[PDB]
């Protein structure tokens, strides 16, 4: 199994690493039908989403998507710095696949 977010990110297609090294600026959360999602933005404009579950995802991802959202909320509320993001870049805004935080 991978050691880093970078090797892990490298196993899928349509992905790339973003080096952020900054806390999240804004957090948006929606329960609107067909739009149950989460969106984060960074000071320099970058915007990422945690997509609404759907057919693209596998059953194992269902529990993982929920965990990712819980993660983004506590991180924002604590103003915790995000190191890197592994995002699928075939979606607008880009979709979050993995995240890392460094101390």
């Amino acid at each position: 199994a991978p050691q880093t977010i970078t090797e892990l990110c490298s196993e899928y297609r349509n992905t790339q690493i973003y080096t952020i090294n900054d806390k999240i600026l804004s957090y948006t959360e929606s329960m609107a039908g067909k739009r149950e999602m989460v969106i984060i933005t960074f000071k320099s404009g970058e915007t990422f989403q945690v997509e609404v579950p759907g057919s693209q995802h596998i059953d194992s991802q269902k529990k993982a998507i929920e965990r990712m959202k819980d993660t983004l909320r506590i991180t924002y509320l604590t103003e915790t710095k995000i190191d890197k993001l592994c995002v699928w870049n075939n979606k607008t805004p880009n979709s979050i696949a993995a995240i890392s935080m460094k101390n």
Copy 2:
């Protein structure tokens, strides 16, 4: 997908964006039968609710409703500032569709 709360809110009928820019003055949670809901209030005078789950909600939303409540709770205890809200105004008090916190 949408990139801001405003963009998202407009995809629905009967919604309106509210610019709070202040924390939740009041928080009410209820386990009472048929009133299993949350109510929040702002110093501005405005009150908002997270509806009792019902027939008007799609399955996708069932789980998002639970998260919104979790979120409002921590937001209130943390005294986190809310940026703006997207609410259905065909309900009283107005129903919460999405939320955004900034800075």
Copy 3:
């Protein structure tokens, strides 16, 4: 829908608003069979419970019950101050129906 706890509390018989204006003194949690419940007391000498799930509750309340417990735990933990509590007074100790915080 109600705009306030007083309002929601009034929709029930054997109900009563207690104006606390104080944080919790003690928190007791039990996982002993048939007594899976939480009890809280205050400096004023009052004691309330979040009842063990039973046939006195309709299905919609099951999720809400657990939530009340999560709310009460963290509230005690954060030394958060309670504003008011709507409770059913036909139980000993009085059973929590809803809670409000403010400030």
Copy 4:
């Protein structure tokens, strides 16, 4: 219903109250096969456990066990004072039936 932990404890056999009045010294968690449990010790040498879910446990407790582990985890992290513990003494280490905290 029971108004205090000492009252509650008294309803079962093979139980006894341990007045700790001290924060938790160590916290141990195992996700190992059939050793899915939590262990806590205090400076006064006493050690306790929240048991692996099993035959002794009725369906209702099942949810209770989980919550209990959640409580100990946060109690440890915030260094909050446990007042008393209602434990089953027919287990080694003694088994937690109910916890109590006071501030």
Copy 5:
């Protein structure tokens, strides 16, 4: 049941204790298909993971894996120090089987 992580660790084949005594340097989380895992790292360069739920786990382990992931996250965010950890050395990174915290 065991009373100490070490003792617990001995009960298993292919395990081994590592004395860390330090906080988590980095935390990585992935919701990508089949790589739904958590990876932790320390300043000494030690990397450990919480494996993807697979055929190697029994049903009771499934819930404990999720809890193991919650703990490492909050533990990281709170800058809490890990004392020891029992791991499976037949995987790369070594897989966490239990963790202990002190003081």
